[PDB]
């Protein structure tokens, strides 16, 4: 089991006939543990803003969540645990573990609920595995 197979087999897998467009597992320091082939280049300020939003829910909501310079509208999330964004019919879920960040970026016809399913459940497993 590699970090790449966690992305390839447990994030980019089929979910009700749909697939994420991008997915990644990041250390909270901003380093890539593994990512899909075209996952956006996350800026240090974007990582810092994500970390701050988990620490202080509502931090990004008025200004937007940014991934590789692309702006997402912060929608309903889970305080301290899950960031969720929307950009048109697409969106993103960011699930925090104790040490890492689990990313999933989707487009139509995939839904936010299907993205939440794959991203949060893998993040839950990593937490239960001590990560």
């Amino acid at each position: 089991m590699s970090w790449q197979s966690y992305v390839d087999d447990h994030l980019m897998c089929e979910v009700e006939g749909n697939h994420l467009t991008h997915a990644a597992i990041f250390g909270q320091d901003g380093s890539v543990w593994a990512q899909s082939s075209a996952f956006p280049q996350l800026k240090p300020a974007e990582i810092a803003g994500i970390n701050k939003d988990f620490e202080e829910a509502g931090h990004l909501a008025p200004t937007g969540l940014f991934l590789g310079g692309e702006k997402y509208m912060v929608v309903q999330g889970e305080a301290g645990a899950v960031i969720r964004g929307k950009k048109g019919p697409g969106g993103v879920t960011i699930k925090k573990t104790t040490q890492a960040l689990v990313f999933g970026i989707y487009d139509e016809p995939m839904t936010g609920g299907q993205c939440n399913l794959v991203v949060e459940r893998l993040g839950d497993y990593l937490i239960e595995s001590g990560l």
Binding site: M1, W3, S5, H10, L126, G130, L131
Partner: peptide
């Protein structure tokens, strides 16, 4: 340094 990947579920 990433920790080792946990055993798969």
């Amino acid at each position: 340094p990433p920790p080792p990947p946990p055993p798969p579920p």
